[PDB]
Design a protein around this ligand. Structure first.
Ligand code: EST
Ligand code: EST
Ligand code: CA
Ligand code: CA
Lengths: 175, 175
């Protein structure tokens, strides 16, 4: 079952999941994405919209991560273009103080020394928004137009056991 | 003609080139490297060893860039492993406020919003050291053992016209 990463204008996310960081036993996520869209947000996450946020998106067809927290502030592009209309497996996880990005089974990016343990964040609640941000795009380190015209499927986010709740503005439109 | 990136213990660089930034008309470099060594420095560069430095090396066989300046401080791994004993083409250049890394003709990493124009650096003199750093490895953001047992060939560094001088401790040992 595949869902549309964009719905309507393409402003707000198609879904927001909230997690209790003190209950996480897994700090990784994975999913498949397919699109012809060269720019947009795949997912945004934060423990604090001002002080500790993260965004994985596409720019010029390639993955881009923006991260802003106490330890690091960055805007980094990496990996092959994914806007070739084919399904691509994507994994994002924490490994020690690093954030690793794997695409189609290959590690394409490792942001080192960027964060303390998820389970140790001052604000023990993490939000994960799909297909959109939880603040205006103008507030990104480097703005981009969030709308991502693509499909998401086979997605797993951290541990379902740590998930506090999940919301969706409109009905998840299938692909 | 190929030269050894390591000579002797593997502490100091095999060569140091100095450039006048006010005369540069090209902010890119390229070379080929071959090695079985998973860790080490390919090249280091700075306009200031304390406040504005850069290091391209290998860690776990993959490219890693560390950069420290007024705009950004990072430690980032990216691209495929290069320690497969085969020749690999590598290009490192500035594009706007970004630093791009291309391997075997493919862009594998783009560090965005990391620097003002090279021609505008307070200290208009850039040093490029090959196979080593110009400060102790303990001073890196993330230390690694600098010795890189590999070969370098077909190397071009910025513009020869902007090169002020070049030095080499020992005789460049051919591969
Ligand atoms: C945990 C994830 C990787 C690490 C990400 C991170 C990493 C560091 C940080 O300071 C904040 C965030 C928020 C979103 C997180 C992501 C949500 C799912 C993904 O697996
Ligand atoms: C200009 C190069 C890319 C950009 C690098 C950089 C980029 C930003 C910075 O603040 C310092 C340096 C020093 C070394 C530079 C490199 C030396 C050769 C390479 O082409
Ligand atoms: Ca788009
Ligand atoms: Ca080594």
């Amino acid at each position: 079952p595949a869902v549309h990463l964009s719905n309507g204008p393409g402003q707000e996310p198609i879904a927001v999941m909230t997690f209790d960081l003190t209950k996480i036993t897994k700090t990784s996520s994975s999913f498949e994405v397919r699109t012809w869209d060269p720019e947009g947000v795949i997912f945004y996450g934060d423990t604090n919209p001002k002080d500790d946020w993260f965004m994985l998106g596409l720019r010029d067809g390639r993955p881009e991560i923006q991260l802003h927290n106490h330890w690091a502030q960055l805007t980094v592009g990496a990996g092959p273009r994914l806007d070739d209309g084919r399904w691509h497996q994507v994994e994002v996880k924490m490994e020690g103080d690093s954030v690793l990005l794997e695409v189609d089974g290959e590690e394409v990016l490792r942001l080192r020394q960027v964060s303390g343990p998820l389970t140790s964040k001052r604000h023990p609640i993490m939000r994960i928004a799909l297909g959109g941000l939880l603040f205006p795009a103008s507030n990104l380190r480097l703005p981009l137009v969030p709308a991502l015209d693509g499909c998401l499927r086979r997605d797993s986010w951290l541990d379902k056991q740590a998930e506090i709740s999940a919301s969706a503005p409109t009905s998840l439109r299938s692909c």
